[PDB]
């Protein structure tokens, strides 16, 4: 019984599991699976440590549900990168058996329509939109089971409220059908204290385990000594070589042990400085003053669109690297990818790596309990350390939080502390969309039945203004009042389809309708101004730098700014010598200026020297602004503005890839991001139709040139050789031509 072979799974999936090394099934997962009536369809929510293999139970459940009853399934994952990684893993797992998978990661959308799809692995922001679309045309029968991850974020978070709304909509739908269950919900979480309340809200039984494949022991240092969590001295520290912080010694213990070490840093500048220090201290500690494959990783970064960074030069050919938010989205995967293989030994990361892809390491070191001027949160601290200890390789994993003076008292509190219990975050802006998602889909019409929906949410299960909040929608024309029975309006139905927050729509509707008065078409700026999402905190603005850029703007672009509220007289003028809606317009204009250079295919390095914002915040904005163009276009489609939908139709593809209008068709191949299509375009190939018929040997030479054996890189499959990738360029083009016709 304690073997995967005894459990029922297709053969191909099983041999795929041997390919990944997972040959022993833990007792906790099997016991939780046999526990209760989970198999026959009743929902479940469970918790486990991150390194224990939380995904195994979800994968077995989705397999069994798909094979038992023919019904499509979902995969809700927090971030885009983890979503793409899980998409590729699931695809490699599911190729042979027949359950095709394809993902909805923000900007990117499937070529095939959903009813053909089976497992739609997707982020929350578009999982909610897909659920709304399915609930729209009474087509919820295809859904058979839904996977959610990290249930702890539905509380105080920017996007978890979408997850809670989607879950409560599913619960409301299945409880309406009772007038065993239509749709399964499975989930994984951290060591949540109130997970029973969460489990009871979805009438699921609770199973909580703390079992770990390898032991984990935290440690806190006091000067030149190491203290355990429970006021215990487990080891006496003694630095070997160094030239109270004694940073190199802790990593130096790992190097002589032949194991990897993860050393995260508070802020952006700390990662570069710390990475150089360890690389600098490797000059004399190992030279008295895998190389071949390490140079290949360095060779990978040489002709990346952003090139190879200066600080990355002095560290990479020594086993030391660093990885933060400011790096390019392509160098982030290379550094992470080779870390899995073990080429790099030291990483200087920020807190963003905590929530990303699994990065196993034997020793994890945290710089300060203070992260960015604020104390470290307990929730991210559990997954801060959870990566320590490789499965089946390392028998002991440890974490060494570094504290000084009086900060030790604050630091030790995290070791004995527990992550805060979840909330519901539900006037409230996250509840306005909650009732708009149900009364516009037509499932709930009578007000009394709507009151039962508020009895099905997380707020109700935890243990007035709900009825006072539909009046807020009544004021803003979102709903028409009839005999009470509520019916959606043109604005109400357009917001739901495009999946925008009703708070933002009121401004957009009055902003998009102000393009009726006057529009410019010589330059893409005004079109881009209506697709720039917001400012958030994507970068720090440079006003004097904006002044020099403001003057040098040609005549055509300056016409746009005056038309949207930006003032030539006041722009980088009063801020130097010293309005919230006015302030959010000027940043909106700067966001549109940056995006226009992105869609002009200007070098990413050149934008840094000109725009002051580095490549890390650029792709974190063009990916976020590409989703916005995909929501404005749908918003204008349902609102009956056929002319505006025409202009913004092509701007989702342009912002995602930073391409021009010419390369829109070439880029449809997944292996041509932004430069593999430009150099290919100059080779006389202007469309994907005739690129599919290209000579295989012809594309090899053209791809060799334009340089700013597995040395060429493609997202999702790590590195590749030039001969194979060039063959993949044509091979992908073969499959596109007949699959869409």
Swiss-Prot record:
> Any idea which positions bind ATP?
29, 48-55
User: Where is it made, tissue-wise?
Assistant: Highly expressed in testis.
The Helicase ATP-binding domain covers 35-210
What results from changing residue 54 to M?
Answer: Abolished ATPase activity
| Region Interaction with RAD51, residue ranges | 709-741
Q: Which intervals of this chain are the motif DEAH box? A: 149-152
Ranges for domain Helicase C-terminal: 244-454
Q: Cellular location of this protein?
A: Nucleus; Chromosome
Disease entry from the Swiss-Prot or TrEMBL record: Breast cancer: A common malignancy originating from breast epithelial tissue. Breast neoplasms can be distinguished by their histologic pattern. Invasive ductal carcinoma is by far the most common type. Breast cancer is etiologically and genetically heterogeneous. Important genetic factors have been indicated by familial occurrence and bilateral involvement. Mutations at more than one locus can be involved in different families or even in the same case.
Q: Self-association or partners: how does it assemble?
A: Homomultimer; forms homodimers and homotetramers. Interacts with RAD51. Interacts with ORC2 and ORC4. Interacts with RHNO1; interaction takes place during mitosis and promotes POLQ recruitment to DNA damage sites. Interacts (when phosphorylated) with TOPBP1 (via BRCT domains 7 and 8); promoting POLQ recruitment to DNA damage sites.
Q: What is known of its domains?
A: The loop 2 region is involved in the binding of the 2 ends of resected double-strand breaks and homomultimerization.
Its function, per the record, reads: Low-fidelity DNA polymerase with a helicase activity that promotes microhomology-mediated end-joining (MMEJ), an alternative non-homologous end-joining (NHEJ) machinery required to repair double-strand breaks in DNA during mitosis. MMEJ is an error-prone repair pathway that produces deletions of sequences from the strand being repaired and promotes genomic rearrangements, such as telomere fusions, some of them leading to cellular transformation. MMEJ is required during mitosis to repair persistent double-strand breaks that originate in S-phase.
Q: Give the family, as the similarity comment puts it.
A: Belongs to the DNA polymerase type-A family.
Q: What is this protein called?
A: DNA polymerase theta
What fragment of the full-length protein is this? 68 to 891 of 2590
């Amino acid at each position: 019984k304690l073997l995967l072979a005894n459990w029922g799974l297709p053969k191909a999936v099983l041999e795929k599991y041997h390919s990944f090394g997972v040959k022993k099934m833990f007792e906790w997962q099997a016991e939780c699976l046999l526990l209760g009536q989970v198999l026959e369809g009743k929902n479940l929510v469970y918790s486990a440590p991150t390194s224990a293999g939380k995904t195994l139970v979800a994968e077995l459940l989705i397999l069994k549900r798909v094979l038992e009853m023919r019904k499509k399934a979902l995969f809700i994952l927090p971030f885009v990168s983890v979503a793409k990684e899980k998409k590729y893993y699931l695809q490699s797992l599911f190729q042979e058996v027949g359950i095709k998978v394809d993902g909805y990661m923000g900007s990117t959308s499937p070529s095939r329509h959903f009813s053909s799809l089976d497992i739609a692995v997707c982020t929350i922001e578009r999982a909610n939109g897909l659920i709304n679309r399915l609930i729209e045309e009474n087509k919820m029968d295809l859904l058979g089971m839904v996977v959610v991850d990290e249930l702890h974020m539905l509380g105080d978070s920017h996007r978890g409220y979408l997850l809670e709304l989607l879950l409560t909509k599913i619960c409301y739908i299945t409880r309406k059908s009772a007038s065993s269950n239509a749709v399964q919900i499975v989930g994984m979480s951290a060591t949540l204290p109130n997970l029973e309340l969460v489990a009871s809200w979805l009438n699921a039984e609770l199973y909580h385990t703390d079992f770990r494949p390898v032991p984990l022991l935290e440690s806190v240092k006091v000067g030149n000594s190491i203290y355990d969590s429970s006021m215990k001295l487990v080891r006496e520290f003694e630095p070997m070589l160094q030239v109270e912080d004694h940073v190199v010694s802790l990593c130096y213990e790992t190097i002589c042990d032949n194991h990897s070490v993860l050393l995260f840093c508070p802020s952006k500048k700390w990662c570069e400085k710390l990475a150089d220090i360890i690389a600098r201290e490797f000059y004399n500690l190992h030279h008295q003053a895998e190389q071949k494959e390490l140079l290949e990783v360095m060779d990978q970064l040489r002709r990346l669109p952003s090139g190879l960074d200066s600080v990355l030069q002095k560290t990479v050919p020594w086993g030391v690297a660093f990885h933060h938010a400011g790096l390019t989205f392509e160098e982030r995967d290379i550094i992470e990818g080779a870390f899995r293989q073990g080429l790099i030994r030291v990483l200087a990361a920020t807190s963003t790596l905590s929530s990303g892809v699994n990065l196993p390491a034997r020793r994890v070191i945290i710089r300060t309990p203070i992260f960015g001027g604020r104390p470290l949160d307990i929730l991210t601290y559990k997954q801060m350390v959870g990566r320590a200890g490789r499965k089946g390789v390392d028998t002991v994993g440890e974490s060494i939080l570094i504290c000084k003076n009086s900060e030790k008292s604050k630091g030790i509190a995290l070791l004995q502390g527990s992550l805060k219990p979840v909330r519901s975050c539900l006037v409230t802006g996250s509840m306005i969309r909650a009732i708009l998602e149900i009364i516009v889909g037509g499932v709930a019409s009578t007000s009394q039945d709507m009151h039962t929906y508020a009895a099905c949410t997380f707020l109700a299960a935890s243990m007035g203004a709900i009825e006072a909040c539909v009046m807020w929608l009544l004021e803003n024309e979102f709903i028409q009042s009839t005999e009470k029975v509520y019916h959606p309006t043109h604005l109400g139905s357009a917001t739901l389809s495009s999946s925008l927050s009703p708070a933002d729509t009121l401004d957009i509707f009055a902003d998009l309708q102000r393009a009726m008065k006057g529009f410019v078409l010589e330059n893409d700026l005004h079109i881009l101004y209506l697709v720039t999402p917001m400012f958030e905190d994507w970068t720090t603005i440079d006003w004097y730098r904006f002044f020099c850029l403001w003057e040098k703007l040609p005549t055509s672009m300056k016409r746009v700014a005056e038309l949207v509220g930006v003032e030539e007289g006041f722009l980088a003028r009063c801020v130097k010598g010293k309005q919230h809606r006015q302030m959010a317009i000027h940043k909106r204009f700067f966001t549109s200026l940056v995006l226009l250079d992105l869609i002009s295919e200007v070098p990413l390095r050149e934008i840094n020297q000109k725009y002051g914002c580095n490549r890390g915040q650029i792709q974190s904005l063009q990916q976020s602004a590409a989703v916005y163009a995909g929501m404005i276009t749908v918003f204008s489609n349902r609102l009956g503005w056929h002319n505006m939908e025409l202009l913004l139709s092509q701007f989702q593809k342009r912002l995602t890839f930073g391409i021009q209008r010419e390369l829109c068709d070439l880029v449809r191949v997944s292996l041509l991001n932004a430069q593999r299509a430009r150099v290919l375009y100059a080779s006389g190939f202007h469309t994907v139709a005739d690129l599919a018929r290209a000579n295989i040997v012809e594309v090899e030479v053209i791809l060799k040139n334009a340089v700013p054996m597995r040395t060429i890189w493609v997202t999702g499959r790590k590195g590749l050789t030039e001969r194979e990738a060039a063959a993949l360029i044509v091979e992908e083009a073969r499959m596109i031509l007949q699959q869409d016709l």
